[PDB]
Each structure stands twice: as C-alpha cells, then as structure tokens.
Amino acid sequence: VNIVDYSDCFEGISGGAIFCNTKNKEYNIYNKELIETRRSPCSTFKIVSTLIGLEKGVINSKESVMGYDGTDYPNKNWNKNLSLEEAFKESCVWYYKKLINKVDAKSVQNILDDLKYGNCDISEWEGDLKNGKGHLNGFWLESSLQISPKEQVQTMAKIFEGDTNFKKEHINILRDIMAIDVNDANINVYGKTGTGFDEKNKRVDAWFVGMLEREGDTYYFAIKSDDSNKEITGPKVKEIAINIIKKYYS
Ligand SMILES: *C(=O)N1C[C@H](NOS(=O)(=O)O)CC[C@H]1C(N)=O
C-alpha cells in the first residue's frame, strides 16, 4: 500500500484515486480518507446492473433491446429502441430503470451482498423522489445505496478476475461495452463515469471506475471527486483519470 500524490493531475479539483494490481498486490492511493468514504455510485452502477440483467435473462447480448415506447427525452439518442451497448454508452436512464424494475428486490439484494457492494442498501428502491424527477430515479442515484472508491475497485477486481458466479459470457459483454479509446494502443482502458450532486453536503459525486490492462498487468481503479463546484462531472473526472493513467501507468 503506497500513498501517492496525484494532485498535479487533478488540476485543483478535490478528489482522490485508487489503483490496485491484484497480482503483485500493489495498492496505490491518493487521498486515503476520500478513497474509504462511501458515496452514491450514480451511473457507475450500470456496471453491476448490466450483469444483473444478463444473469436474470432480462437482456442477453450487447444487441438486446428493452422495448422503447416512444416517450420524448431531451437526449436524442434516448428516443429510440437502443441496444444494450448504446444504452450503456449513452447512459440511457429509462433503459436501465426498465431493466432493473423487471428484477425482484431479493435477487438484487443477494447479488449486492455477494459482491460486497458497499452498504448494499436498496431500501429506497424508487430513489430520491424529492428531486422531482419521478421515474428517472433509483436507489443507485444519490439515494440509499453507497459504496466507497476502494470498494468499487474491490468489486471490479472480483468480477473481472472471474471470482464471482456471473457467466464468463456476460463478463465479456461488459468488458466489450466498457472499453474506451484513449489514443494509446499499448494500454487497454475500460470504465464508466457517474455524476450526481450530494444535496446534503453540497458536493458533487463524480466518478470514473474501471480497469487498465498493460502487458500482462491489470490495474483496477476508481477516481472520485467530491468538489463543491457543480461543473465537476463524471466526464471531467474521466479526463483526470486518463491523465493519471498516461502519466503514471504507461
Ligand atoms: C449517471 O450518473 N447519470 C446518468 C447520466 N450519465 O451520467 S454520466 O455522464 O456521468 O455517465 C446523466 C447523469 C446521471 C443522472 N443524473 O442520472
């Protein structure tokens, strides 16, 4: 366990980072206090909800559809019968809400328990209804479910090293749709952003969680901001993560 200083890459934004190589057990941590603090996963939960949907047969492949009903949304890409791959990349809320609401709560509780997914608290299934967004809410979006960045890394490692009961076929679908292009062919990066605002504490929850493969070595990582500036989003924290990867993990 090495404490490290990645502040240069955060460019003034408050946050922390954790990278873990489970082969040679090297855990690199920037802002240990924050890395151990549980927060809403926001859209990073789509990593797990995709696997839940595959395991329960709600969806079956990166092509699978959820039966778009014509509802109007501001994001143009949400207004179509999009595939799993496109819903994941567009972070399409209605698709993932419809997917999870086809799964019984006890099945979800038991999967989160098995994964040790933070507090595993799905008690507020419908999410943070006081924000007015109605059915565009759920337990994973600034609601009852909370997970620390370290726990995110621990969960990703267990999934992608083959240490859960999820089917290998389903893990590979997830890997496929999580892959990102960082304009460096010598590292494979996979991840998912998340964005929320913690109304209680007046701070963002901005995430980028995933893994890095570079010649035999694999690093599981979570980068997290808790800045008070509402302009700090998941996508911005993903840029910070990419800078860290290129600087220190190339
Ligand atoms: C998930 O965090 N969300 C869904 C969507 N995409 O977020 S992302 O760009 O950080 O990946 C919009 C923000 C957020 C939400 N409000 O539901």
Q: Structural domain boundaries of the chain?
A: 2-248
Token reading at 173:
């679908």
- Alpha carbon dihedral 39, 51, 239, 250, in 10-degree steps, equals 110
Half-sphere exposure at residue 145, Cβ-oriented, CA atoms within 13 angstroms: 26
- In the reported structure, the alpha carbon of residue 57 is separated from the centroid of ligand 1 by a whole-number distance in angstroms of 25
Give strand ranges (E) for the chain.
2-3, 15-21, 26-30, 179-180, 188-198, 203-214, 217-225
Residue pair 45/145 in contact by the 8 Å Cβ criterion: yes
Assess whether the C-beta atom of 22 lies below 6 angstroms from ligand 1.
Answer: no
Please name the residue that has the structure tokens 């490290």: 4
**Single-letter residue type at 233:** T
Token reading at 99:
């997917």
CA distance 140 to 50: 13
**Distance set, CA 187 to CA 8, 153, 164 (Å):** 22, 18, 25
193 CA closest ligand 1 atom index: 11
In this structure, how many other beta carbons lie within 10 angstroms of the beta carbon of residue 81?
A: 12
**Single-letter residue type at 144:** S
| Strand-pair partners of 208 | 193, 223
Contacts of 123 (CB under 8 A, 6+ apart): 139, 144
Burial class (CB in 10 A: 0-12, 13-18, 19+), 121: middle
Nearest Cα to Cα of residue 214 among 19, 7, 14, 13: 19
Q: Going edge to edge, which strands form the sheet with 203-214?
A: 2-3, 26-30, 15-21, 217-225, 203-214, 188-198, 179-180
**Single-letter residue type at 176:** D
Terminal Cα distance for the chain, rounded: 20
Assess whether the C-beta atom of 212 lies below 6 angstroms from ligand 1.
Answer: no
Structure determined by: X-ray
Assess whether the C-beta atom of 15 lies below 6 angstroms from ligand 1.
Answer: no
Instruction: Please give the resolution of this entry in Å, rounded to 1 decimal.
Output: 1.8
What is the CATH number assigned to the segment(s) 2-248?
3.40.710.10
Token reading at 11:
């460019």
Assess whether the C-beta atom of 162 lies below 6 angstroms from ligand 1.
Answer: no
Q: Coil, strand or helix: which one is 224?
A: strand
Residue pair 27/10 in contact by the 8 Å Cβ criterion: no
DSSP 39: B
Contacts of 162 (CB under 8 A, 6+ apart): 168, 171
CA geometry: angle at 234 spanning 57 and 122, to 5°? Answer: 45
CA distance 5 to 174: 31
CA distance 136 to 184: 36
Nearest Cα to Cα of residue 48 among 241, 210, 233: 210
**Distance set, CA 250 to CA 45, 75, 201, 214, 246 (Å):** 27, 35, 36, 8, 5
CA distance 99 to 92: 11
Assess whether the C-beta atom of 195 lies below 6 angstroms from ligand 1.
Answer: yes
**Single-letter residue type at 6:** Y
Assess whether the C-beta atom of 234 lies below 6 angstroms from ligand 1.
Answer: yes
DSSP 167-211: -HHHHHHHHHHHEE--S-TT-EEEEEEEEEEETTTTEEEEEEEEE
CA distance 85 to 81: 12
Sign of CA dihedral 107, 111, 113, 117: negative
